[model samples]
Target: NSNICEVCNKWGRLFCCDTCPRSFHEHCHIPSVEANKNPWSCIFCRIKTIQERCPESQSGHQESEVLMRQMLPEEQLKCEFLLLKVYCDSKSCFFASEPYYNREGSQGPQKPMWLNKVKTSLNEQMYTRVEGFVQDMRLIFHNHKEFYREDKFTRLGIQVQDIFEKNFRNIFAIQETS
Candidate 1:
């Protein structure tokens, strides 16, 4: 993944954070950046996923462990925050409800995902791992791919998906995975 400025999208004088693949212009970086880049970390990379004294924080542990374990209380809260952000977006609100009010001939299988289903799963604690929750989040977008050819609702789905992912990664302090 070639680096792009998180804010400006310019590649010319990008600064690399030692912690994340993300790069930024010194001016675009939050707070500020200087030549004192010796082992520097960018904003989200510098934030702790589980905070200082939590059980998950450690000097060195495999990141894979995060996905293997059940969601922590704080993580659950973070998930809800992301959901609320999605629910807050006007375009995303249309996705929270099932696409009902249809006549007979809807094109694909009616068994599609909506944010409502995802919220229900969250409330019931049906998501086993953070990864599971991420999967469902992607499913919301994946299902939208079926209607990508000028279907505007799916366009909004993609928009909400972008919101979900950005907050999810920032909150978790993680990177792309297979």
Candidate 2:
């Protein structure tokens, strides 16, 4: 709906973005744009590229208690997307349901973290930033390393953490940074 190209002041026929009011001449946007008949989306408006939720089996399960804070919408979206990738494999939820036997006997660390805790925190919008959710999730893996050693559950945490890292970069487009 802009009178001029969004990237510059020059006058030209502009293609309007369906998601926002910005207008871009066919060749003006970064990497440029090609005119099209149907409504179009600009890069700025399509930051959330994941069109559908992760598989239904991975939906977060709710449990009462330990809820606080909230994430920015953009951060929350990516955080959930990453969590879904972590849960795409049923084994990724191993720590969530595991009996959690502890070597410290004294409850390893005060207010320890686990996969289920991460799920609960996410479900209630308790993390202020995606980074917080990520660290909390990562804590589940390191906690396993510290208390549970190289048991199968601990190994599973590591594997899921790897999946999280890959999806995190993709969702956030870290590869695009120069």
Candidate 3:
């Protein structure tokens, strides 16, 4: 145990934190007081705290938080929310799923692959894209519900898949996966 904290000074029982030499009780020293909580200290905690507080820590924060937000627009907001919700709802297991739904939203990059376009009868025979989209939605719904049965859509997705697959086939007939 030391006589005083190198930072805060008062001296009775100067006990040093086993992991932090710089954090010692003012009166934990044997010569000053009898009992001790921890009399040993490590260089590791000092070094770690120094590294975390240094200017270098600022440089590391930027890249580590790039996808911390999502970008979208209003008027077409529901479409945007639906797409983002479906994805975030699926990837929430690995990533943050907030910026996509909660109000105030986020900014940048609109992913187009998550859309359902209105089709005209003349070009209605196309199945590949729609089928793939439907397949993806099915898988997302299945995996999500399988893992989260408490969600309200656990059974509804199965029924929606049946109905929507029919709509998908009727609109687009190329069959990319099958």
| Backbone clashes counted, model 1 | 0
Q: List lDDT for all candidates, in order.
A: 0.65, 0.59, 0.34
Superposition error at 156 for model 2 (Å): 2.1
- For all the candidates, what are their Cα RMSDs to the real structure? 11.0, 16.6, 24.7
> For model 3, how does the per-residue alpha-carbon lDDT over 1-178 read when each residue is reduced to its tens digit?
3465532355544455566444344322212222533544332243345446664532322211322222222112222222323322332232222113222332322322212221111023233332233444455445544543565544655654454444333222223343
Per-residue alpha-carbon lDDT of candidate 2 for residues 17-37, written as tens digits (9 for 90 to 100): 887888777644532464453
TM-score of 3: 0.23
Worst 10 residues of 2 by lDDT: 60-69
Error of 3 at 132 (Å): 4.7
Clashing pairs in 2: none
Q: In candidate 2, how many clashes are counted?
A: 0
Among these predictions, the greatest lDDT belongs to: 1
Q: Model 1 over residues 125-167: C-alpha lDDT tens digits?
A: 8887777777777777776656454656557767878887776
lDDT of 1 at 19: 74
- Model 2 alpha-carbon miss at residue 100, Å: 2.7
| TM-score to native of every candidate shown | 0.56, 0.52, 0.23
Better of 1 and 3 by lDDT: 1
